[PDB]
């Protein structure tokens, strides 16, 4: 074998963008919205190819969040997918190892919302976020109760309080 | 010549990041903070080279803002600089032309805070007419100083008279 490429959205060919969309719809068995695809664009993509065919993907989006009262730069992991017949071969793990490298070089903290999918992320050093989660709804921050226990975080240095509150920035669709 | 290269922050070595810092400090005559440099990192860099010598740069950072009540994905332009002896030759214009292409392919709106605005206007950018808000002490406040300084580029429409609420960061919010 599998070839891996790290490409910003601006560096994708039009062909690669359409393959990616198809891969995400197929890999999530349709449970992937237009908002979810919008969240996948604008940052870095790690893509896995079997020769010329796209078979795996993860994206890393820059988000601007607050850790308690402190601003933090976040590499937010979106749209992790491997084509069904290529699964359970370690592609997803390699995508995450490359993801960790990107986060370590650019952002203060990695974050993601898992599935069922937690064991893979835990195997490359990610941990469940234990503090409160907040999102903007109708103007002001509310608790993201549904997501608490599902969001996972990662720091290279490990020097971050996983019990602290996280306030995420405003976007369409699912905030996490 | 001048060669132009577009690299994500994760595609840069330590020396190239250091060359970028030095260019920014020199080009802004020291009026560029450690926070300003943090704002420069994490997105796309358009860089101009005379041979192996970095002589120009602009960054495009993804930001998540609200246009009035609606969320808007923003390519935010940071750290536009050309080395002093290379100015008034078209490099800044070419850096903005590459910037526009990146914004057009990734984001709904391009934004920046200027400091002359003629260059940006020459490449399609327009002064933002709506109120601007930033966070201070956890509550949004009129970015009164910024209003009239922030410019937008439509990635095309977006109503430039709507209120913009920027997302939270260290240092200057705009
Ligand atoms: C989640 C997903 C990307 C995992 O991709 P993957 O390529 O199968 O990932 P890996 O092969 O690295 O790991 C998958 C499993 O096979 C194991 N494995 C690792 N290397 C292996 C190898 N050489 N041979 C066999 N199995 C291996 C892993 O330990 C892991 O075990 P687990 O499921 O019990 O935790 C994939 O299942 C997928 O696309 N799901 C649909 C979309 C989705 O849910 N994305 C995640 C949302 S958070
Ligand atoms: C802002 C900055 C990047 C411009 O870079 P630049 O390479 O000089 O940009 P350009 O050469 O494309 O255009 C600048 C001017 O030179 C003119 N110009 C361009 N090529 C020219 C040429 N061959 N002959 C004569 N004039 C020319 C342009 O018409 C333009 O005129 P204007 O300012 O009245 O609009 C540079 O001044 C700088 O680094 N300033 C320090 C950083 C700063 O203060 N602010 C960051 C911007 S918000
Ligand atoms: C804590 N319980 C969880 C749910 O909460 C829900 O977690 C959602 C989460 O997977 C989504 O991330 C992945 O899934 C898809 C698309 N899938 C939804 C179809 O649009 C996009 C990116 C994926 N991530 C990666 C790394 O690839 C998050 N984007 C949103 C999470 N939240 C919700 O959907 C609800 O709160 C809706 C309220 N607005 O799933 C599983 C769960 C354990 O039961
Ligand atoms: C509208 N009047 C303006 C002021 O408002 C102020 O505009 C600031 C603006 O240039 C800054 O962007 C540029 O400057 C630097 C370095 N900046 C100085 C060292 O930190 C970083 C990136 C630059 N942009 C690009 C595209 O490269 C913005 N980041 C912030 C703007 N606001 C302020 O500085 C003050 O309101 C608060 C400061 N505590 O100066 C210029 C002005 C026209 O007079």
Numbering used by the authors:
A (entry chain A): 2 to 116, 118 to 178
B (entry chain B): 2 to 116, 119 to 159, 161 to 178
Original authors' sentences:
However, a newly developed aminoglycoside antibiotic, plazomicin (marketed as Zemdri), was approved for clinical use by the U.S. Food and Drug Administration (FDA) in 2018; and since then, sister agencies in other countries have also approved its use. Like other aminoglycosides, plazomicin binds to the 16S rRNA at the aminoacyl-tRNA site (A-site) of the 30S ribosomal subunit, interfering with protein translation. Chemically, plazomicin is derived from sisomicin, an aminoglycoside that closely resembles gentamicin, with synthetic modifications incorporated at the N1 and N6′ positions of the antibiotic. The N1 position is extended by appending a hydroxy-aminobutyric acid (HABA) substituent, and the N6′ is modified through the addition of a hydroxyethyl (HE) substituent.
